[PDB]
Design a protein around this ligand. Structure first.
Ligand SMILES: O=C(O)c1ccc(CN2C(=O)C3(CCN(S(=O)(=O)c4ccccc4Cl)CC3)c3cc(Br)ccc32)cc1
Lengths: 228, 12
């Protein structure tokens, strides 16, 4: 029927942190103005990818309990969720935030950046599949928090501490499905489908970086350090 | 190692 005052408080903190994301004006202006070349298109995308890492960290820091975790486990969670959080935020932006005209130029830039179809095809396939679910802002925010507070990421020393933060988010998300979609009992199951679909992007992304060499304009030293 | 993530996490 309704969220408990404690669940409402937890949801508000995640919503507030999630709603802080705002695509910078200089990035939006570049999508419109810059030359339509593989080199210029790839540079725009690298800047967007780098900007997402800063957005992710700032969002994560405000997640209830994140700051209470061991410092090395905070790093491990950020590193283990970076790719997954990026594709999820990208799916939200592509289906909601960006206007039809600029989304079209951004899609044109992505499709003409030098990146292989082996990575572009599952990317847009996932955006369409996310779009079908007509996710609310509470659902995107909670799914993002769930993705980041994953207890099974590599190099986590205290997994029980992370499970204690992830379990109440899964409880709130399932409750929100029961309140807002009481006619569709499979709504929560569809959202879980996106968690497993997002996991497939870790491999796709790792291979994409491997395809990049020093001789090519695609070599991104900073991003390659954050992604391993 | 993890110098950028560390800096961003341990700032403001
Ligand atoms: O507020 C900000 O500053 C900000 C900026 C950015 C994002 C998210 N976002 C992305 O990161 C990309 C996806 C990955 N690609 S990419 O070119 O495919 C690539 C590049 C390098 C390494 C791997 C990958 Cl997959 C770059 C752009 C993207 C495409 C859309 Br549409 C919407 C969103 C996003 C969120 C917030």
């Amino acid at each position: 029927m309704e969220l408990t005052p404690d669940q409402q408080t937890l949801l508000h903190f995640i919503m507030d942190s999630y709603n802080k994301q705002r695509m910078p004006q200089e990035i939006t202006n570049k999508i419109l103005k810059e030359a339509f070349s593989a080199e210029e298109n790839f540079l725009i995308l690298t800047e967007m990818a780098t900007n997402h890492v800063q957005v992710l960290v700032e969002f994560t820091k405000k997640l209830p309990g994140f700051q209470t975790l061991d410092h090395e486990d905070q790093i491990a969670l950020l590193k283990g969720s970076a790719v997954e959080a990026m594709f999820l935020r990208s799916a939200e932006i592509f289906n909601k935030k960006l206007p039809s005209g600029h989304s079209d130029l951004l899609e044109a830039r992505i499709r003409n950046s030098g990146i292989s179809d082996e990575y572009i095809t599952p990317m847009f396939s996932f955006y369409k599949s996310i779009g079908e679910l007509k996710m609310t802002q509470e659902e995107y925010a909670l799914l993002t928090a769930i993705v980041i507070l994953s207890p099974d990421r590599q190099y986590i020393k205290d997994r029980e501490a992370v499970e204690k933060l992830q379990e109440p988010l899964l409880d709130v998300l399932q409750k929100l499905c029961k309140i807002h979609q009481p006619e569709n009992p499979q709504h929560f199951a569809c959202l879980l489908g996106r968690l497993t679909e997002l996991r497939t992007f870790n491999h796709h992304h790792a291979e994409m970086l491997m395809s990049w060499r020093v001789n090519d304009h695609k070599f991104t030293p900073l991003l390659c350090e954050i992604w391993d | 190692d993890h110098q950028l993530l560390r800096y961003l996490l341990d700032k403001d």
